[PDB]
Curated annotation (Swiss-Prot), chains A, B:
Protein's name in the database: Growth/differentiation factor 8
Keywords (A to Z) from UniProt: Cleavage on pair of basic residues, Cytokine, Disulfide bond, Glycoprotein, Growth factor, Heparin-binding, Secreted, Signal
Parent-record interval covered: 268 to 376 of 376
Source species taxonomy: Eukaryota, Metazoa, Chordata, Craniata, Vertebrata
Organism name: Mus musculus (Mouse)
Post-translational modification summary for this protein: Synthesized as large precursor molecule that undergoes proteolytic cleavage to generate an N-terminal propeptide and a disulfide linked C-terminal dimer, which is the biologically active molecule. The circulating form consists of a latent complex of the C-terminal dimer and other proteins, including its propeptide, which maintain the C-terminal dimer in a latent, inactive state. Ligand activation requires additional cleavage of the prodomain by a tolloid-like metalloproteinase.
Coiled-coil region(s): none
Function: Acts specifically as a negative regulator of skeletal muscle growth.
Description of the deletion phenotype: Mutant animals exhibit muscle hypertrophy.
Swiss-Prot record, chain D:
Species per Swiss-Prot/TrEMBL record: Homo sapiens (Human)
Domain Follistatin-like: 65-85, 135-158, 208-232
TB domain location: 1-74
Molecular functions (GO terms): activin binding; activin receptor antagonist activity; heparan sulfate proteoglycan binding
Tissue expression notes: Isoform 1 is the predominant isoform in serum but is undetectable in follicular fluid. In the embryo, strong expression is seen in the palatal epithelia, including the medial edge epithelial and midline epithelial seam of the palatal shelves. Less pronounced expression is also seen throughout the palatal shelf and tongue mesenchyme.
Keyword Metal-binding listed: no
Protein name as catalogued: Follistatin
Protein localization: Secreted; Nucleus, Nucleolus
Amino acid sequence: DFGLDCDEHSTESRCCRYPLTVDFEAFGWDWIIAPKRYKANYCSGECEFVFLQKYPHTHLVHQANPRGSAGPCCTPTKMSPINMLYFNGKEQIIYGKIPAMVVDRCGCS
Amino acid sequence: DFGLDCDEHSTESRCCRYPLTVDFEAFGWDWIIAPKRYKANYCSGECEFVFLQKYPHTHLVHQANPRGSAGPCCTPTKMSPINMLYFNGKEQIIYGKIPAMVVDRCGCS
Amino acid sequence: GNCWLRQAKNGRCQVLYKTELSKEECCSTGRLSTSWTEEDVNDNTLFKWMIFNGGAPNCIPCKETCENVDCGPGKKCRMNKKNKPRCVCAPDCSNITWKGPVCGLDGKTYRNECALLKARCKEQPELEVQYQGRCKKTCRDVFCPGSSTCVVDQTNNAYCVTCNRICPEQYLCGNDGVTYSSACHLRKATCLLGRSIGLAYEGKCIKAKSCEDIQCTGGKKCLWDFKVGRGRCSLCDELCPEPVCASDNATYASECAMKEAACSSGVLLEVKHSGSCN
Amino acid sequence: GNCWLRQAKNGRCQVLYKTELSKEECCSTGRLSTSWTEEDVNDNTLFKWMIFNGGAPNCIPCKETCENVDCGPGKKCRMNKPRCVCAPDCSNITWKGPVCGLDGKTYRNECALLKARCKEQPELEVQYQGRCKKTCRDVFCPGSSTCVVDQTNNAYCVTCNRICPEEQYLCGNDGVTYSSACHLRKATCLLGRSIGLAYEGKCIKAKSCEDIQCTGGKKCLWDFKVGRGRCSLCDELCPEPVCASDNATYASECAMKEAACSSGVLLEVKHSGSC
């Protein structure tokens, strides 16, 4: 409830999380055994005023408006791991939990 | 040792942390007793390839290039609080840690 | 007033969504947590409350009860302990014929398929049954569904997986002394074997009689396996931070220290068992 | 080869900074942790090692001893690998004893506070000499600063803004009318402790809550100890037990506040723990 989820049917301008399936075979990640595909999701949309901002720093910097400071951008504020079975660099079969593969939540930073 | 720090005299194109002082009086945040000023810093610079990316999710979304996805942006990957003394909404003197006021590290997300 | 994505546990509004909206506009969807505040205030006042006072006060939740809440697929609305509507996992378990435990992809045994579907919904969105029954050690009497096949990981856990049966038509030498024409081929054969074979070195296998016959590359060093009479190129670049008995029948303080000694001496060492050889 | 921001604890390279450059290029700044790998490889292979294998192997640290390292202002290089340690200039400090940091913590001396500032807390400075104190009794603030206490009675030396721009009347819990928030804050600051806002508008000589009309979704709470009311938000929820001023025990401080809000009776904590 900390973020917005959208889909293809949404008409949402704000920073929002959308669906996306990643298919490893199609990406060239041929060392992965399982899973073959997974829902990674992604973040998209606008960051105006302080909408969807969790950190006071963000708007403090925007008002200070210093040189080189771009506007805030829509970005993951929470990530989740996925469990994978894959071949390591020695071609051994390894089960491991791989951090930060999935976006759980999007916000403006 | 996880990020780059830069000053006005850097010729660093990549995502980097730069200094910035925030002055609460100048901002008109007049409920703040102390401190009057602090070092907030800010993030600026380019994010190409997989440079300065901590999360594998970032480049995976890039490869897929779904509608609405913007390239990775240079953003805080680590924030710090500051101790503050201020008047709360009841005008009581409160000491507290205010989270995410300072950027410690910048990265491409 | 202002529209917020949530009422915090302290009861105040957080996560600004929109400004200058009436309640009717802010609350016009089925989204569970959306909340509203009446007051329109200048920026600084807003910041004052959001940052230093725990959120905007007089936060009014759009949904006071389960009426009109749209939890989405496989979820239902139920009032919680603090009397607030909540979306809770309610998977349809109605068409499930298998009644016993199941082994999830995560390698964990679930009580039954209904419990796995709950964990999928609650925590692990990529969770699925990989095979029926409890999870197993070794592939003995593991019968994988359909045309998937059994392999074990580094801890002897059994998984049912689909082997990449078709490689695209970079030589490697496996620790089995077999030359493979690519990674894909070595991986395919590994999958069919059901356990790691392991990469010995890049290029074609040679009938080495010692490490002198093997020219490692990529900053690797040759380790000789005296048990099988074949060599192996290993990185030897890892640093070390439970004593083990190695295949040389010596005790080392750690599996990591054993690897350091293997690397130093050019002799392949494997853990025989835990604790001192003596 | 590839240039990396650091060598991890496992010895492998992490945090990709630049690709296709030579050791001398990568290693050409004063950055302590920068590291290099020789092999240029295709993208997927690179991702494979970074994500699934603990980083890029055969990581070669640029700086293996202290020579050529730029630790920056306040710090100096020292072998532990080489490491940048905090070494503030203390040779110029006159005061010798404990000091109270702006963070409210006592430091053994100013030099220790300096090192903590360099190491952990960039905003850290001395607010007054000696140990941090409870209450403002015998706290002698330096310069133009004055003492105030926070919600836990800790003393701070601060600079009480004394300039207010002369419609926004407020009634303080002291029964005094202030012409603005700025004035109430100034008086509070001068008093040395919270006075607090009773309600918007000028104070009225109220005899009960019926005499006070709260504004903006607030409820009147009557203080029977002093015979004055205040308007409180009463909007907070409760997600150690206390003994309240009604001499009753409550499961929590805001359970107490909830009871106060329902009854219209101001309640304060007498002490922590059951009555």
